[PDB]
Amino acid sequence: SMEQVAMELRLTELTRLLRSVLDQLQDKDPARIFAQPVSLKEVPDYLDHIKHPMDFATMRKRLEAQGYKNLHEFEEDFDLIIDNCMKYNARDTVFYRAAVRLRDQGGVVLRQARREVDSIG
Ligand code: NA
Numbered sequence: 001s002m003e004q005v006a007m008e009l010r011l012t013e014l015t016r017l018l019r020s021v022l023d024q025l026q027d028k029d030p031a032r033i034f035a036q037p038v039s040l041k042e043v044p045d046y047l048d049h050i051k052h053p054m055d056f057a058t059m060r061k062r063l064e065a066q067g068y069k070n071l072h073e074f075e076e077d078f079d080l081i082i083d084n085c086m087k088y089n090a091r092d093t094v095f096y097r098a099a100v101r102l103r104d105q106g107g108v109v110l111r112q113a114r115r116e117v118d119s120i121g
Contacts, residue, residue, distance in 0.1 A: 010121065015066050018074050021113050022063060025078065026056050028105040033098045034081050038088075049088055056079035071117050075110060082106075 029035065037055045038046050046053070059077050068074045082099045089095035 003108045007025070011066055011069070013120075014117070015063060015068070017113065017116060018063055018068055018071070020058070021074070021109060022059060025102070025106050028102050029056070029098070031098060033095060034085070034102065046088070050084045052080055053084060054078075056081070066074075071114055076108065078110070 019029050026035070037058060038050075039052055040046055054077050058080075059074070062068060062077070063074075068077075082103045085099035086096055089099075
């Protein structure tokens with residue numbers, strides 16, 4: 001049907017928007033602490049602590065398979081990256097502090113993206 005194509009045009013434009021959002025958020029991690037999943041070869045107990053690991057590479061695989069139906073889903077994944085980091089790593093570490101910074105800087109970009117999604121549909 002034609003309706004199915006027009007829903008596919010809107011998912012495709014969302015995905016165009018979220019790719020921009022993602023690259024904007026990844027720029028706020030110039031250290032690349034969050035670019036890849038945490039290694040289970042280097043942190044073998046990681047899954048005893050963190051139940052739903054998340055990272056920018058994993059978000060990008062999903063994004064490009066148009067697996068984010070809306071901004072909420074994409075925000076959930078972003079918060080996992082931050083939120084898991086602040087649990088695994090103690091407050092006085094470069095990792096925890098890097099998360100705090102990404103969260104705060106990320107909040108501006110996400111604040112305007114929720115406006116563009118609402119505005120444009
Ligand atoms: Na902790």
